């Protein structure tokens, strides 16, 4: 056998990828574009010597 093999459907893989990305964004408290929705902190340095 030296023939070629069948290929998956790209559209379904696209659906799976989109679902995975959306679920990951939802579970980690991020917007639909990946922008974080929580403010960070600065941890100001405590003076010089």
């Amino acid at each position: 056998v030296g023939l070629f093999l069948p290929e998956y459907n790209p559209a379904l893989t696209d659906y799976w990828q989109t679902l995975r990305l959306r679920l990951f964004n939802l579970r980690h408290n991020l917007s639909i574009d990946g922008q974080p929705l929580s403010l960070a902190i600065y941890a100001e340095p405590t003076d010089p010597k």
């Binding site: 579970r27 980690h28 408290n29 929580s38």
Partner: protein
């Protein structure tokens, strides 16, 4: 202290999910992944600690998930007669608060 508590909660959740998946099996349900636990117990154990909710809201979400799974014949042995009530017939309008 709050950040440490969140980290501890996440680690404990992962450890407990792994232990339950490894040691305990229910009577007639086979589950092999964390998503299976999510679908079985109707509560998401993979969420980050940042998100917040109320008990009634999570109960509503769990029951809605259970109804959606049962209606679409994903979970076997669903009662056919019960699934034809007036409430489920209009599920296109009762699935959201």
């Amino acid at each position: 202290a709050q950040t440490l508590a969140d980290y501890t909660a996440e680690r404990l959740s992962s450890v407990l999910c792994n232990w339950f998946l490894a040691n305990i099996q229910p009577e007639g349900v086979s589950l092999h992944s964390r998503d299976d636990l999510y679908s079985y117990f109707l509560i998401d154990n993979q969420v980050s600690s940042a998100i917040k909710t109320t008990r009634l809201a999570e109960a509503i979400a769990g029951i809605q998930l259970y109804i959606n799974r049962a209606l679409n014949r994903i979970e076997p042995n669903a009662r056919a007669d019960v699934s034809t009530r007036q409430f489920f017939t209009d599920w296109t309008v009762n699935n959201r608060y």
